[PDB]
Ligand binder design. Sequence first.
Ligand SMILES: O=P([O-])([O-])O[C@@H]1[C@H](O)[C@H](O)[C@@H](O)[C@H](O)[C@H]1O
Ligand SMILES: O=P([O-])([O-])O[C@@H]1[C@H](O)[C@H](O)[C@@H](O)[C@H](O)[C@H]1O
Ligand SMILES: [Ca+2]
Ligand SMILES: [Ca+2]
Ligand SMILES: [Ca+2]
Ligand SMILES: [Ca+2]
Lengths: 252, 252
Amino acid sequence: MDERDALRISREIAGEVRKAIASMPLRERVKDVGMGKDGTPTKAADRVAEDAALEILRKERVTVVTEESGVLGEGDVFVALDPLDGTFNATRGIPVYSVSLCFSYSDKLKDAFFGYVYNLATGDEYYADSSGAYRNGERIEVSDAEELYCNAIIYYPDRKFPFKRMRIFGSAATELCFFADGSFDCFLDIRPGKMLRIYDAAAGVFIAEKAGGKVTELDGESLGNKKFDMQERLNIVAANEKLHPKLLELIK
Amino acid sequence: MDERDALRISREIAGEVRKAIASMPLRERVKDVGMGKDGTPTKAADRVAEDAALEILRKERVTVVTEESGVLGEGDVFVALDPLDGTFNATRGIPVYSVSLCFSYSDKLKDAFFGYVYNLATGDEYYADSSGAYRNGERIEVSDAEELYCNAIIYYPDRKFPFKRMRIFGSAATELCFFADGSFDCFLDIRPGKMLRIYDAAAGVFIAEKAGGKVTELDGESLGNKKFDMQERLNIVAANEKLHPKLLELIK
Ligand SMILES: O=P([O-])([O-])O[C@@H]1[C@H](O)[C@H](O)[C@@H](O)[C@H](O)[C@H]1O
Ligand SMILES: O=P([O-])([O-])O[C@@H]1[C@H](O)[C@H](O)[C@@H](O)[C@H](O)[C@H]1O
Ligand SMILES: [Ca+2]
Ligand SMILES: [Ca+2]
Ligand SMILES: [Ca+2]
Ligand SMILES: [Ca+2]
């Protein structure tokens, strides 16, 4: 299965999902539909989003790990998918919530060949493959801000940082794409509770990688080990090559 | 002048400035076109939207307090104006930025008689008159649980909080409407080195209060006798009556 397969496939889910959510009223969006396979509740929006993706991913020889219903599939290709990363905003009318998909051969991130995040509010498309990282087509790349005094996304500010700006938009998959497109110089989820799963960073992380930004874990150990599994958790420190180090040191 | 004209005038300015920025590519958006009369530099998206905004207000008998052109016109009626709140977003294509407008029968916040916030990204409309606060033509109210374990907007987390969620979206006018909505449980701008100006907040402040909100300065002092000029600087703590005291002590 080509990257062109993954892209073609990915382009279908986003649209299917988009109008499934779009048609959905905020009132019929926030109600809970049960308990997804990862411990967290499940809103209607959640269900509707995942179904539309599964119905298409379903026809592909792929094993999928996803929030609402753990593992599914069998294929020799794995998908770390999130129908709706940023469910709080979506149920709020806040226009920052996306579809996340990452395509890999093996069980682990290291063998992933395609990244794709789609903002379902705006219709903004984020993707990456061997060719590169794009947003709405135009080629992107992380920023070259070399100063700790810079624009940042931080989960969560706990001390007093030397940041020019600090934002928190509530959709890790999308904000990693904000880091990816140079709109932001560093992504940071140093949350002690290590409350970040694979179907969250998977897609985002990989586009960031393509866009030219170094991305690892709290200490610096890569994300490679990471598995398309329901137990996997993580923290992230993302920045170009001249920022990541200093950004590490600053959180000791 | 009454709250019907303010709406009608505001609705027009919302149309033109919307037209203005939308057709305008991002490249130009980020363009430095000189310095504004307040320090915070003027970029093309700024200039483009003030221009559009000013072009309408000025043919009314009012004194305008705007970001770039300082104070303008004459009239017992005052208008605090943020022609583009969330410039950084507007420049990067992050769909949170608005046009903020507050009208008062005095230069005093306390005499405000109309408030208005328009998401230039989603065409989402917030306003507040004598009848109540509304969002896209619907009546909003603030949220209601006194538990600190709530959903907060806070500029900036310097310590450790008992909040369920912390978001910073970079447009205080709209964010104060996010609070006024129900979307977020509390708004807080406790930054010591104060940076909120009358125009970024007087509208939100006014829509939130009609929303059922309690906005006061850091110390719980009302924002009533707050002046419309390029010197005022604010700190804000907004929430329902019940959780407001709590937040004071929390950040006490
Ligand atoms: O809640 P969700 O919308 O499914 O996804 C959330 C977003 O990625 C958020 O940015 C992150 O910090 C949270 O940990 C995730 O749970
Ligand atoms: O610059 P501007 O976009 O007009 O207004 C800014 C926004 O309201 C932002 O939320 C706030 O944190 C800044 O302090 C303001 O300067
Ligand atoms: Ca999700
Ligand atoms: Ca998620
Ligand atoms: Ca402005
Ligand atoms: Ca402003």
